[PDB]
Design a protein around this nucleic acid. Structure first.
Lengths: 85, 103
DNA sequence: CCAGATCGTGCGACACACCGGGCCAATTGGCCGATGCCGTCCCGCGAACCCCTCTACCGTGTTGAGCAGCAGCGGCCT
DNA sequence: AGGCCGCTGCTGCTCAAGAGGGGTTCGCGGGACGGCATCGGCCAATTGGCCCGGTGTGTCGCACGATCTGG
C-alpha cells in the first residue's frame, strides 16, 4: 500500500483531462454533470438540489443528464477518454 | 516476498474541498482540566467521556448524569461465608474462639 | 500559298445571384399521465459467539586485543 | 590493631477436561413500506425544403469572323 508515483501522476492527468472534455459541452450540461457527480466538491447532490440552482423541474434534470451521457458515450468523444479506462 | 499491512488508502487530497459544519462541545474534569471536542451537527451528544489530560472520566459542562448501580461488586469472602454457612455456625465457632482466647 | 487553333465577338441558355416572400415536410422531445417492480428498513426468530463460573480420594522444588574499574592483600604509619 | 598507600589479580565492555448459565452478535429470512422507473399518446414549434416572381451578373454552349503560325 505504497503510493506509486506513476499511478499518482496517471490519476492527476486523468483528473485534468476529464474537465476539458466537459468544457466543450454546454454550460448547463457540464454544470449538472459536475453537481450530480460532485467533481468540483465531492458531495453528490440530489436532483432537487441541482434543479434548485437552474429552477428546472426534477424530470428536466433527469433528461438533461441522460443526453450528456449519450453525447459522451458516442464514437466522437470517447477516444480522448478510452485509454484511462 | 509480498506483504500488506491491513491499511487502506485513497487517491484524494485536502485542497479544493469544503468542510462540513461542526459544533464544539466543552468537557471538564474533576481536577479542573477543560477541553473542546468537535462533533457533527447531525450527531447525539453522550453524557460521559474520557479526559484529554489525565485520562479520567469527565462530564459535560451542565450535569444531568445520574448513577445506575452495576451488579458485579459482589465477590468477597464475607458473602461466600454467608452462602456457605448459616449464622448459628458462625456464632458457635465465634463463642468457642472467644472462650479459648480468654482462657 | 492557306486553314484550323486561338481568340474576338455575339446570341442564347442558363445555373444559379440576389434578397425577399409564403407556406410546408421531417422530426420532433419533453416527460403528461398512468402503471408497476425494486431498495430500504424494521422487526422476528434463531444459530453461533464470546465470557464467566465450578470439580473435594490426592497431590507440596527449576578469540584476540584493547581499555578501564573493583576486591583482596602486602606492607608502612600511627 | 585500625587506617591508609600502593600493588596485583580478577572481571567487564567494545571493535573487528469437561459441564452449566447468560448477554450479545449477526445471519437469515421475511415481508412491508415507499418510492422512482418505464410505456401509449401529441401537437404545433425552431431549423431546413420547396418553390413563385422579377430582373441582373456572370459562366458555359455553341454560331460568324479576324490573326497567326505551321503544314
Amino acid at each position: 500500500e505504497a503510493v506509486v508515483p506513476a499511478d499518482a501522476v496517471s490519476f492527476t492527468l486523468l483528473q485534468e483531462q476529464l474537465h476539458s472534455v466537459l468544457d466543450t459541452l454546454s454550460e448547463r450540461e457540464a454544470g449538472v454533470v459536475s453537481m450530480r457527480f460532485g467533481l468540483t466538491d465531492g458531495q453528490p447532490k440530489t436532483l432537487d438540489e441541482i434543479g434548485k440552482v437552474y429552477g428546472v423541474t426534477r424530470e428536466r434534470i433527469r433528461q438533461i443528464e441522460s443526453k450528456t451521457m449519450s453525447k459522451l458515450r458516442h464514437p466522437s468523444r470517447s477516444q480522448v477518454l478510452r485509454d484511462y479506462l | 516476498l509480498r506483504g500488506t499491512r491491513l491499511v487502506v488508502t485513497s487517491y484524494e487530497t485536502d485542497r479544493g474541498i469544503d468542510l462540513a459544519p461542526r459544533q464544539a462541545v466543552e468537557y471538564a474534569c474533576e481536577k479542573g482540566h477543560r477541553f473542546e471536542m468537535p462533533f457533527s451537527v447531525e450527531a447525539e451528544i453522550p453524557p460521559e467521556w474520557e479526559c484529554k489530560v489525565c485520562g479520567i472520566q469527565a462530564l459535560l459542562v451542565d450535569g444531568d448524569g445520574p448513577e445506575e448501580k452495576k451488579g458485579k461488586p459482589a465477590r468477597t469472602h464475607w458473602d461466600m461465608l454467608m452462602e456457605r454457612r448459616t449464622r448459628e455456625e458462625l456464632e458457635e465457632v465465634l463463642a468457642e474462639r472467644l472462650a479459648v482466647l480468654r482462657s
